[PDB]
Nucleic acid binder design. Structure first.
Ligand SMILES: [Mg+2]
Ligand SMILES: [Zn+2]
Ligand SMILES: [Zn+2]
Lengths: 87, 1266, 108
DNA sequence: CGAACCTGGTCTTGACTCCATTGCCGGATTTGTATTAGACTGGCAGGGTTGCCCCGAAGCGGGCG
DNA sequence: CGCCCGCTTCGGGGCAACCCTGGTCTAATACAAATCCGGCAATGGAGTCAAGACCAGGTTCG
């Protein structure tokens, strides 16, 4: 059954979720909220930068600057070797 | 009752499903025979895989793809119509097929008896002519109208019969005028007078044709009129043209249909209670087979009346569809699709229903419509069970389509396969090798395999330690095998037992638990002392390895199934880890004593001293390391750290056998001293020669006296010393070490002279061919025994071939006789004896004809071995399927009813001589009676274990008959109690209160059947449990008195004069192969016989010896006879393993009276339940049922259980189930067989409620410790 | 060596949130034989007044929303198949010839 | 201390652009249906194996004259 | 004393589970609806660029 549960990747996925939650915990509140509402990780709905600025009371260009800041923050291999392992 | 699967039911009520329930379960009428679109490979709309019906194939994905995520959940896409959920509910949701015409279920139609015909009191062939559209049947007639109109209808019938009379009158008058015209035209014209007579004859033929034709018209008129009088429901109307002329002629007064609609109408206008009371009256007052037939109908009538069911569901209005994942259509590499053979049946039913609906809405001739309905009926019938009616529907290769009933019945059915067992994860297998340095609770393991077993544990451990930053790095570390992973493997292996398992598991010791340890290589190193229990030699046999995961499972394997905890038998309590071949030979060489050996103690003290004494065994050890002392030499050491045997100890000091501070001498060997250094300090000295029987007795005494850990360590030390002296024993095999006797040839010469005299005697014709065969057989058997005696006296004991046998390591003497000496007589293929013996040994080398003679017996022995292990598997199957519901449930049933055991009946000279079968019968049982000696001292109280010293005490007291408790008389109902079971053989202590002794007993009976060497043998054992009739049925007496012994013509006619007022009991067919039973002297005429004394010596039937000698003796007859077989093979089976089965057979009595409370003649019901109903019915109508205890056979007593789910795994599963849904028999899941199937915690051992619900919390002192 | 298979469907692995869902309406449907059915549509969803329900038939909406009655046509009749090859006067002459045939049956 | 500077975020506006989003029309292809007038009008996989029970013919002892 | 009658009894037989002594077909055509898909052609919100303006407190200088 090649379309069945491989059952190591599922627990790997759950552990990946928890480690990713820890990594988002290592950053600030606005950053974590922006990434979560951006990729829809907290609900399942990826909102856009205009919605994040709508719920945040700031420009969508500010959301894009926050995005670039967070993606630069994420791309430390010193920070994200534990996530480089997860692929 | 909820189907929400919370893993607690305690109840399971099967039953018939109504059409309302079928349309209630489903999710929309599937209505197209389209499974998967050929191009897009998506399921078709409203077809057999339709996602709107069953569910989505992609996880939380609507079919059109609008909603696609888990936020949209529990809703339905308005476009695509598929409710969004997971994909696994496609395993769950059923669909239904609506039907245009109704349908009868074949499970109530093609049965024996057909329950449809038994509810409506109709023939089977009536049904095959109704719902295959070959006959009509009325369902109602308005007789309230039909009588008051039938007056006028008789008037109109007489009018129309008068009209046919007027027609034949006018027709015969026309023929009379034509005959008159023929006569008037024939008379006046001259011709042949014969031609005129033949013209008159043609006119006469015409008028006789007219008169009998209109006569038969009138007969048909009065016939259809008489049919209208005899117009009633449940009437068959064949040939239907009578029916068609009866429809128009007064069609309003009846309702005649044909088919499943007619059956449904008949069930509709069916007050079942009316025929219920009618059948009550008929079985009350009737006579003969009409009464028993009304009983057989009243069974199912009261069955339908009793539950909340209705016979409306016997017809079918909507057919449910099994959810499509259970009948999947999977494609393969290259897109090779694979159907599931039900889709074709479903497609045929769907197509035929659609076609029938189309023709009904169109309007068609009724031949076409009824033919399509018949095709639909046959399609549904084959869909449920292909091949139940008519020819089986097949497919490509003419292979029959695996229909729905095929998933249940048969060996590939769900019940048998689910009972057969599943493949498991965390498992593995390998070949095995010996582990001669391992400890007993230990097994070797290859690191390449144990790495694969413990992969999740090793991943968790090496991701806890800094070697991986997630489980993926750890997994690739496992696959790429970094060298730290073996250290992590040792960490996770330490104190984690695995399960071992040989191929076929004959008994409970076939699965053991061992602490593993890593071993280089790839073969499971296995401890050598457990191969006896496993029956696993090292010829290439492979053992599987499982693994427990939970804390509960690890505790179960650690305490229960550990190797050191299972040394004694479940069968006879003897130790199975007692050593053998190499260890036994080494210990035999180490403990034998050879006189004249080096360093021998001599008492010679003249000028020189005696020179045979040693202050210390260590001093003796140094004296043996130097080339002075042989270890089998007689010496006199002074032991200080060993208990002297009881005589020297008690005479040396005041009973305080203080072997730490003892200081005493012994004239022994060094070897026996070193051997008794293996044994514990508390054990006395042995000072014997280690035969295998002596070692068995030693380990028996150790197990019944000491804790099992000391037995385990002692057995381990014994193995090591046994191997170390197995090397030094020098037991080799040389061709010079096989000596042939020098007087062999003269023995064969003399017996050849005797054989030649017999051959000359047959050559004279002085005797027949068979008798000279028998003469040669006796001559050569005596010659072979003489050869064996000459070889026995010829060999010395140091000969290693005779040393192996004489130790008791292995082998009989007959193997040595075939090695050197004579082969003997070799059997025929049929089993007869070849008259030419093989007079050459295997050392001398055979000749070609002798080898050709030996091949027959060799081939037959191998075939017998294969058939014997197959039949032993079947016998254990039957025994487990009978005795699986006898577990210990109470501590003491506390009856006084118990059987009496013989226990060493005496000798006439005054000696209480020991009976042989004491250790199989009288051992290990709780005494129900107190043991008293002429009412002197009460020597043994009620409820002792009946072990060794109390048996010796009663032997000294001289009393023999002891009324001991047993499971044949256990007063508990749910299983047996504990004290009636007595001592557990596996422990030596009392049996615990959850041990399933039925399965222990069944395995211990069925296991050694392969060593049973075949009227007598394993089939004789097999029919004995099955309560069959013996083919050599030796007769029994029925009453006391002197016999009228008389021998007739080819068979004897032995009568018996009754000693009482009774008739002279005639015994008729006593064939010449039966012989007079010798007892007490031979049987004689006028010998006074007993009540049930056996007439001839042979096999008595159990059923009549039940009917003569009551139920007590028929247990004692069954037990001792079966045990007599296992005595003959030298197999120790304790009788309480037999006595579990015999108690299971006599669970039910027969019933002939209904009495006062709902019984049937010949009904087999439980004795206690028959007792139970009588106590509630002796008050309020005290008419009990006339009961009689009956013995019923193993395959029959198994099938007559109350748990139908257990009974489903037995036989033709349809007839297990079709009555079960009719009776609505709710199973209670109380047997351990059914809880296996549903995966419930089985109620035997750890699963029972007294042990499973233990609250565990520390002491409050201990909480104050930290 | 080993032949593998795949049932053609997607299998994901997510969290079954019974709390964070898209909210949703419920539309009650009434079939031809008065059967009630409560189809869960989404919130943002046009509700069709007609719906093939679980009953195996068409179930209209429980409200008086007045869906389209027929929007269909009859397939064909045997009379249409007859009219494609014969004349009305041809069939009327056959009607009169069978009227005279039943006249000969009745009173002739 | 007073103050200029330097670079950390922080946010705004304004423009831009860019790629989904329909949307419509044109065509391609695919699927289902209707119609093909000389005559033609009743068969095929099916049997053999094992065993268990249902039922009519027959002994047969009891009822009847 | 013998003649009739249902109870019983056995042979006949009637019938449920298993197996295996055990395939090539006229042939298109007309048409209408459905459906796919392919290419311009409106977007229009959503992402991107960039400039620039808000300062806030280290950095350094007087
Ligand atoms: Mg072997
Ligand atoms: Zn959809
Ligand atoms: Zn008891």
């Amino acid at each position: 059954d090649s379309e069945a549960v491989v059952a190591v990747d599922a627990v790997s996925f759950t552990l990946l979720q928890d480690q990713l939650q820890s990594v988002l915990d290592t950053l600030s509140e606005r950053e974590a909220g922006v990434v979560r509402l951006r990729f829809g990780l907290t609900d399942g709905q990826p909102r856009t930068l205009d919605e994040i600025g709508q719920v945040y009371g700031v420009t969508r260009e500010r959301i894009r600057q926050i995005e670039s800041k967070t993606m630069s923050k994420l791309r430390h291999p010193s920070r994200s070797q534990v996530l480089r392992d997860y692929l | 009752g909820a189907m929400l699967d919370v893993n607690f039911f305690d109840e399971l009520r099967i039953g018939l499903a109504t059409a309302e329930d079928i349309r209630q379960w489903s999710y929309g009428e599937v209505k197209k025979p389209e499974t998967i679109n050929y191009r897009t490979l998506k399921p078709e709309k409203d077809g057999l895989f339709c996602e709107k019906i069953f569910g989505p194939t992609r996880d939380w994905e609507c079919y059109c793809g609008k909603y696609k995520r888990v936020r949209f959940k529990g809703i339905i896409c308005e476009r695509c119509g598929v409710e969004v959920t997971r994909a696994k509910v496609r395993r769950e949701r059923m669909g239904h097929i609506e039907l245009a015409a109704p349908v009868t279920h074949i499970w109530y139609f093609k049965g024996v008896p057909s329950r449809l015909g038994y509810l409506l009191d109709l023939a089977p062939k009536d049904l095959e002519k109704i719902i295959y559209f070959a006959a009509y049947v009325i369902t109602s007639v308005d007789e309230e109208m039909r009588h008051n109109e039938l007056s006028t209808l008789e008037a109109e019938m007489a009018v129309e019969r008068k009209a046919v009379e007027d027609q034949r009158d006018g027709e015969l008058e026309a023929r009379a005028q034509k005959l008159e015209a023929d006569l008037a035209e024939l008379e006046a014209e001259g011709a042949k007078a014969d031609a005129r007579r033949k013209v008159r004859d043609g006119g006469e033929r015409e008028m006789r044709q007219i008169r009998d034709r209109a006569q038969r018209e009138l007969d048909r008129l009065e016939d259809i009129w008489s049919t209208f009088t005899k117009l009633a429901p449940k009437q068959l109307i064949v040939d239907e043209n009578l029916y068609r002329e009866l429809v128009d002629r007064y069609g309003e007064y009846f309702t005649g249909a044909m088919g499943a609609e007619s059956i449904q109408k008949l069930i509709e206008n069916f007050d079942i209670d009316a025929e219920a009371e009618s059948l009550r009256d008929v079985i009350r007052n009737g006579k003969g087979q009409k009464k028993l037939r009304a009983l057989k109908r009243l069974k199912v009538v009261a069955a339908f009346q009793q539950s909340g069911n209705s016979p409306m569901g016997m017809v079918l209005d909507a057919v449910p569809v099994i959810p499509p994942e259970l009948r999947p259509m999977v494609q393969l590499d290259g897109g090779r699709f694979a159907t599931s053979d039900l889709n074709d049946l479903y497609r045929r039913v769907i197509n035929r229903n659609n076609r029938l609906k189309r023709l009904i809405d169109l309007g068609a001739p009724e031949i076409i419509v009824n033919n399509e309905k018949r095709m639909l009926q046959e399609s549904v019938d084959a869909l449920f069970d292909n091949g139940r009616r008519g020819r089986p529907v097949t497919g490509p290769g003419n292979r029959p389509l695996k229909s729905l009933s095929d998933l249940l019945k048969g060996k590939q059915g769900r019940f048998r396969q689910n009972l057969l067992g599943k493949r498991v994860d965390y498992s593995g297998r390998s070949v095995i090798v010996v582990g001669p340095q391992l400890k007993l609770h230990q097994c070797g393991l290859p690191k390449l395999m144990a790495l694969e077993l413990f992969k999740p544990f090793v991943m968790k451990r090496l991701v806890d330690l800094n070697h991986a930053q997630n489980i993926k790095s750890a997994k690739r570390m496992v696959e790429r095998q970094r060298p730290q992973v073996w250290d992590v493997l040792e960490e996770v292996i330490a104190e984690h037992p695995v399960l071992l398992n040989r191929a076929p598991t004959l008994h409970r010791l076939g699965i053991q638990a061992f602490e593993p340890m890593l071993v280089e290589g790839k073969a499971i190193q296995l401890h050598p002392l457990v191969c006896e229990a496993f029956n696993a030699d090292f010829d290439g046999d492979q053992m599987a390895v499982h693994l427990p995961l939970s804390a509960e499972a690890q505790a179960e394997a650690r305490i229960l199934m550990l190797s050191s905890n299972n040394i004694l038998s479940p069968a006879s309590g003897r130790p199975l880890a007692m050593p053998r071949l190499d260890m036994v030979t080494g210990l035999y060489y180490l403990t034998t004593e050879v006189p004249g050996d080096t360093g021998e103690y001599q008492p010679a003290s003249g000028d020189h001293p005696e020179t045979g004494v040693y202050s210390s065994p260590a001093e003796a050890i140094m004296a043996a390391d130097r080339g002075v002392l042989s270890v089998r030499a007689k010496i006199k050491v002074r032991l200080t750290q060993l208990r002297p045997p009881v005589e020297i100890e008690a005479e040396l000091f005041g009973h305080s056998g203080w072997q730490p501070g003892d200081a005493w001498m012994a004239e022994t060997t060094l070897g026996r001293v070193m051997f008794n250094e293996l044994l514990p300090l508390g054990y006395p000295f042995v000072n014997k020669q280690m035969h295998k029987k002596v070692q068995a007795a030693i380990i028996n005494d150790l197990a019944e006296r000491y804790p099992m850990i000391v037995v385990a360590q002692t057995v381990d030390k014994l193995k090591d010393a046994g191997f170390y002296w197995a090397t030094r024993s020098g037991v080799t095999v040389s061709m010079a070490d096989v000596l042939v006797p020098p007087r062999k040839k003269e023995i064969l010469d003399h017996y050849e002279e005797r054989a030649d005299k017999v051959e000359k005697q047959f050559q004279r014709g002085a005797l027949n061919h068979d008798e000279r065969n028998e003469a040669l057989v006796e001559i050569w058997k005596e010659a072979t025994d003489e050869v064996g005696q000459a070889l026995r006296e010829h060999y010395p004991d140091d000969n290693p071939i005779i040393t192996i046998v004489d130790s008791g390591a292995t082998g009989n003497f007959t193997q040595t006789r075939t090695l050197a000496g004579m082969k003997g007589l070799v059997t025929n293929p049929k089993g007869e004896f070849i008259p030419r013996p093989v007079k050459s040994s295997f050392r001398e080398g055979l000749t070609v004809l002798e080898y050709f003679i030996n091949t027959h017996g060799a081939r037959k022995g191998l075939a017998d071995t294969a058939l014997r292990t197959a039949d032993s598997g079947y016998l254990t199957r039957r025994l487990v399927d009978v005795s699986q519901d006898v577990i210990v449930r109470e501590h003491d049933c506390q009856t006084e009813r118990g059987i009496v055991v013989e226990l060493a009946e005496r000798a006439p000279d005054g000696t209480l001589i020991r009976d042989p079968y004491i250790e199989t019968s009288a051992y290990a049982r709780t005494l129900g009676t107190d043991a008293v000696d002429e009412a002197g001292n009460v020597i043994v109280e009620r409820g002792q274990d009946l072990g060794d010293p109390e048996i010796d005490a009663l032997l000294a007291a001289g009393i023999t008959q002891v009324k001991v408790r047993s499971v044949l008389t256990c007063a508990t109902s749910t299983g047996v109690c504990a004290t009636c079971y007595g001592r557990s053989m596996a422990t030596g202590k009392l049996v615990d209160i959850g041990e399933a002794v039925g399965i222990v007993a069944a395995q211990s009976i069925g296991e050694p059947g392969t060593q049973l060497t075949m009227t007598g043998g394993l089939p004789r054992v097999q029919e004995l449990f099955e309560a069959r009739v013996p083919r050599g049925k030796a007769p029994i007496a029925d009453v006391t008195g002197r016999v009228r012994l008389e021998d007739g013509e080819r068979f004897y006619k032995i009568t018996i004069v009754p000693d009482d007022g009774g008739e002279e009991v005639v015994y008729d067919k006593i064939s010449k192969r039966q012989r007079l039973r010798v007892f007490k002297r031979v049987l004689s005429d006028g010998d006074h016989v007993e009540v049930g004394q056996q007439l001839m010596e042979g096999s008595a039937d159990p059923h009549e010896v039940l009917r003569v000698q009551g139920p007590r003796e028929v247990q004692i007859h069954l037990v001792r006879e079966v045990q007599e077989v296992y005595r003959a093979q030298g197999v120790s089976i304790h009788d309480k393993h037999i006595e579990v089965i015999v108690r299971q057979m006599l669970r039910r009595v027969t019933i002939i009276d209904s009495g006062s409370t709902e019984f049937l003649p010949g009904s087999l019901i439980d004795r206690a339940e028959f007792e139970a109903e009588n106590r509630r019915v002796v008050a309020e109508g005290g008419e009990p049922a006339a009961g009689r205890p009956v013995l019923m056979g193993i395959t029959k007593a198994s099938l007559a259980t109350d748990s139908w789910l257990s009974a489903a795994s037995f036989q033709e599963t349809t007839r297990v189930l079709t009555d079960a849904a009719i009776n609505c028999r709710s199973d209670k899941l109380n047997g351990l067989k059914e809880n296996v199937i549903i995966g419930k915690l089985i109620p035997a051992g750890t699963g029972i409620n007294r042990y499973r619900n233990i609250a565990v919390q520390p002491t409050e002192e201990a909480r104050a410790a930290a | 060596r080993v032949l593998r298979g795949s049932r053609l469907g997607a299998v994901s692995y997510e969290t079954d949130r019974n709390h964070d869902l898209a909210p949703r309406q419920i539309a009650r449907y009434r079939t031809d034989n008065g059967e009630e059915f409560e189809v869960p549509f989404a919130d943002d969803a046009e509700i069709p007044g007609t719906w093939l329900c679980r009953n195996g038939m068409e179930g209209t909406l429980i409200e008086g929303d007045l869906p389209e009655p027929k929007k269909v046509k009859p397939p064909r009749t045997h009379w249409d198949m007859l009219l494609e090859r014969r004349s009305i006067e041809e069939l009327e002459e056959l009607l009169k010839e069978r009227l005279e045939l039943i006249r000969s049956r009745r009173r002739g």
